Amino acid sequence: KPKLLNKFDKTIKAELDAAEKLRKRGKIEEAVNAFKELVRKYPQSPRARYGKAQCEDDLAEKRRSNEVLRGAIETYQEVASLPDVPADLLKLSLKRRSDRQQFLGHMRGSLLTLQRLVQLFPNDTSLKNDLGVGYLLIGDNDNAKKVYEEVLSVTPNDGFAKVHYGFILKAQNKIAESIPYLKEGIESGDPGTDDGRFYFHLGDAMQRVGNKEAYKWYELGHKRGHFASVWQRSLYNVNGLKAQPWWTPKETGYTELVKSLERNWKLIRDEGLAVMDKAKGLFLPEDENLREKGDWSQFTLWQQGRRNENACKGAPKTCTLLEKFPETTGCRRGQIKYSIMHPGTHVWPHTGPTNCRLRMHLGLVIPKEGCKIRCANETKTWEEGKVLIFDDSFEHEVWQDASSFRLIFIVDVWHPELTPQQRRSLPAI
Ligand SMILES: C[C@H](CC(=O)O)C(=O)C(=O)O
Ligand SMILES: [Mn+2]
């Protein structure tokens, strides 16, 4: 039902459908030459020009070629330069241009295309919504906010506009205000609203204002395929890995590493305390997004399988100990770090990025009351010289309500069901 042919193109239809059928057949290189061999013969036609670009676009996905695709992006532009081009075709070509610009990371180039589209079609709500995304992708939340406010003033129940507006409010620290927008947008069911990122932000906003319905939305997100379960919501996952929030050492099979950590725990503690005492600047403030209140810092020895040489000069015996255990030093999706937390601290519920690791905590200095960690529905506490093991792809939350500082040692390990070849080939995050 789209109209892609001006007065001209209608005359040469039998040819245009030929070059088109070649592409639908998958015989791409000929559609290209076919189309390419029609502008020299049919320079003025939009639909012929559009066809050449569609071919380049397809050749690009086939050949995995950015260079090819850059060619398509210009030919899509050429379509819009010709006379009496039909609105439906103008819109198709520039929209695809913007999308492929965005694919290459030409985010401001895409924004300029989308600005053009809105000038051409000042009443197409869909295109304003896309323009707002263009402003978000260059980091310009203020202009995106104005775009969606415009959309909502004309079409107040557009769910796409609502979920993006809620996201923008949340990023501006209007957390409570974002929630009804996210909810209503998701509930509209409109195209582009059934997106795990809006379930993520809705659930996070609700948890951060004490609303217990967050878990209803995580569960809905799960049923919609955005989360592994109501509790396990990491983004970068491998299928088939045992999924439980708390593990015993025997269950992980890394019993020799647990033994080494527990049996040498005072040395690990003492090296951490020495760095605290002498080089306290080496403890870096933890994730400010996750820290509701308090004072929480970390001193990293390994990051994604890469040893920090300057840090291992501060904790040399501990680094030496760990070098025996590639299940953690070679965990490209994990970290090895000391983690200190002072009284009055609360870490918001969150998950880690991957189900490919397990997270070990060795207790080094644990006040006798006040410190606890929840993973999923079970809350536990640390002990000096003992390891706890949890799957941090499950939601977890930490409180420090003691009267002195709490020091732990955090050791990530590859999930034990990952094969050697999987461990070798997984990208770091
Ligand atoms: C809050 C905790 C760390 C800590 O308790 O120092 C956490 O999120 C984690 O181990 O992943
Ligand atoms: Mn965490």
From Swiss-Prot:
Chain positions recorded as 2-oxoglutarate binding sites:
W296, S339, R359, M360, H361, R406
The primary gene name is ASPH
Assembly, in brief, is: Monomer. Isoform 8 interacts with ORAI1 and STIM1. Isoform 4 interacts with CASQ2.
Q: Which residue positions carry a glycan here?
A: N123, N377
Citing just one GO molecular function, the answer is: electron transfer activity
Instruction: State the name under which the record lists this protein.
Output: Aspartyl/asparaginyl beta-hydroxylase
Please cite one Gene Ontology biological process associated with this protein: regulation of protein stability
Gene Ontology cellular component terms for the protein in this record: calcium channel complex; cortical endoplasmic reticulum; endoplasmic reticulum; endoplasmic reticulum membrane; junctional sarcoplasmic reticulum membrane; plasma membrane; sarcoplasmic reticulum lumen; sarcoplasmic reticulum membrane
Residues that coordinate or bind Fe cation: H350, H396
Q: Which cofactor does it need?
A: Fe cation
Family from the record: Belongs to the aspartyl/asparaginyl beta-hydroxylase family.
